[PDB]
Paper text:
Human paternally expressed gene 3 protein (PEG3) is a large multi-functional protein of nearly 1600 amino acids with a mass of about 165 kDa. Consistent with the presence of a large number of zinc fingers, PEG3 has been shown to bind DNA in a sequence specific manner, and has been detected predominantly in the nucleus, supporting the notion it is a bone fide transcription factor. PEG3 contains a [name] domain near the N-terminus.
Here, we report the structure of the isolated [name] homodimer from the human PEG3 protein (PEG3-[name]). Crystals of human PEG3-[name] belong to space group P65, with a VM value of 2.44 Å3 Da−1 and solvent content of approximately 50% for an asymmetric unit comprising two polypeptide chains. The crystals diffract to a resolution of 1.95 Å and the majority of the residues are located within well-defined electron density, apart from a few residues at the C-terminus. The human PEG3-[name] domain folds as an extended V-shaped structure, with approximate overall dimensions of 50×25×25 Å. Helices α1 and α2 which form an N-terminal sub-domain are aligned antiparallel to create one half of the V. A C-terminal sub-domain, which forms the other half, results from α3, α4 and α5 being packed together. A hydrophobic patch comprising Phe49, Trp74, Leu75, Ile85, Ile86 and Leu89, from α2 and α3, make van der Waals interactions to equivalent residues in the partner subunit.
Author numbering: 1 to 90
The structure:
């Protein structure tokens, strides 16, 4: 159903290793966070791969374009590519 999956993406990426918690509990947490981000029960392996490609692409955007790309929120790669095909001379 509708969720803030990006909240979980950020938590997954920003979780820190806390010695008091230790390795097994840290694995459990990471797994829960990644599943609440990617919701594999709703998506195919192919769709998941596309999300990972999008995640990486968003990080490598030239810095001068990042505010623009994010104001726009392209929700998939194709979008992002057609957008950068028309946003660049900045």
């Amino acid at each position: 159903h509708m969720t803030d999956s990006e909240f979980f993406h950020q938590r997954f990426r920003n979780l820190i290793y806390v010695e008091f918690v230790g390795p097994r509990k840290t694995l459990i947490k990471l797994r829960n966070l990644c599943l609440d981000w990617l919701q594999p029960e709703t998506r195919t392996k192919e769709e998941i791969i596309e999300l990972l490609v999008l995640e990486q692409y968003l990080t490598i955007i030239p810095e001068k374009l990042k505010p623009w790309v994010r104001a726009k929120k392209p929700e998939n790669c194709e979008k992002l590519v057609t957008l950068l095909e028309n946003y660049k001379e900045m």
